[PDB]
């Protein structure tokens, strides 16, 4: 489980998406430190111009790289599922706006960690905040309230994300998440993200006990 996360671990992220007739593929490459809670990644859209702003995809684009304190070692589901891996299912509602439905798989493939993702965008208003590209190239710090799930031997997590509209307004994005381990208590993750193709740096830790 945590045997594999001690030290630097390379990452490969793939994502296929369909949003209002526009399809796109995004590849991500980099590394991650779970002992520190770091994530340095460089995402590239292989279909040219993305029909959707990058910051909306950040949320869906690997929660086993989040830092764990030594008193929450026994609450890190993500690392325990490894190397067998878990499925990352999520639906995302943009208030007064369109919805994502996603499914993804996180596994170890060799010495590198691999995350392939499926994405489907529905009911998005054109010239909106999403299809109009009216969201700023930034991402704030959020709480990710994780809850245990004995019905599916896995994890659920609810949270909503404030995207910053260029008018000074705020676009909300509700997240319902489910995670199920392939094979065989209420805490939360505080995150922090900087947008700098697309480059990212993140620091995420576990708190609430
Ligand atoms: Cu499709």
- In the chain, where the domains are located: 1-209
Distance 123 CA to ligand 1 centre (A): 14
- The structure tokens listed for 105 are 């798989």
First-to-final CA distance of the chain: 22
Å resolution of this model?
Answer: 3.5
From the options 3.40.50.1100, 2.40.30.130, 3.40.718.10, 2.40.155.10, give the CATH code of 1-209: 2.40.155.10
Distance 32 CA to ligand 1 centre (A): 30
Distance 100 CA to ligand 1 centre (A): 12
Report the 3 state secondary structure along the chain. Answer: CCCCCCCCEEEEEEEEEEECCEEEEEEEEEEEECCCCEEEEEEEECCCCCCCCHHHHHCCCCCCCCECCCCCHHHCHHHHHCCCCEEEEEEEECCCCCEEEEEEEEEEECCEEEEEEEEEEECCCCCCCCCCCCECCCCCCCEEEEEEECCCCEEEEEEEEEEEECCCCEEEEEEEEEEEECCCCCEEEECCEEECCEEEEEECEEECC
Distance 47 CA to ligand 1 centre (A): 15
Comparing CA positions, the residue from 146, 106, 143 lying closest to residue 9 is: 106
Question: How far apart are the C-alpha atoms of 86 and 153, rounded to whole Å?
Answer: 11
Distance 26 CA to ligand 1 centre (A): 15
Expt. technique? X-ray
Distance 120 CA to ligand 1 centre (A): 6
Distance 18 CA to ligand 1 centre (A): 5
Question: How far apart are the C-alpha atoms of 20 and 98, rounded to whole Å?
Answer: 10
- Three-point CA angle 117, 200, 14, nearest 5°: 20
């Amino acid at each position: 489980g945590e045997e594999l996360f001690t030290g630097v671990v390379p990452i490969l992220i793939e994502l296929d998406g369909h949003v209002n007739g526009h399809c796109f593929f995004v590849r991500g490459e980099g590394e991650g430190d779970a002992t520190i809670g770091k994530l340095s990644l460089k995402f590239i859209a292989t279909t040219g111009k993305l029909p959707v702003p990058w910051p909306t995809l950040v949320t869906t684009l690997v929660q086993c790289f989040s830092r764990y304190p030594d008193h929450m070692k026994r609450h890190d589901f993500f690392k325990s599922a490894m190397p067998e891996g878990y499925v990352q299912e999520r639906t995302i509602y943009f208030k007064d706006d369109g919805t994502y439905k996603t499914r993804a798989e996180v596994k170890f493939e060799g010495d590198t960690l691999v995350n392939r993702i499926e994405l489907k965008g529905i009911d998005f208003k054109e010239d909106g905040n999403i299809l109009g590209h009216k969201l700023e190239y930034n991402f704030n710090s959020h709480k990710v309230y994780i809850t245990a799930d004995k019905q599916n031997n896995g994890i659920k997590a609810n949270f909503t994300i404030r995207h910053n509209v260029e008018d000074g307004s705020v676009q909300l994005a509700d997240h319902y998440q489910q995670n199920t381990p392939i094979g065989d208590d209420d805490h939360y993750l505080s995150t922090q993200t900087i947008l700098s193709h697309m480059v990212l740096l993140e620091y995420v830790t576990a708190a609430g006990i």
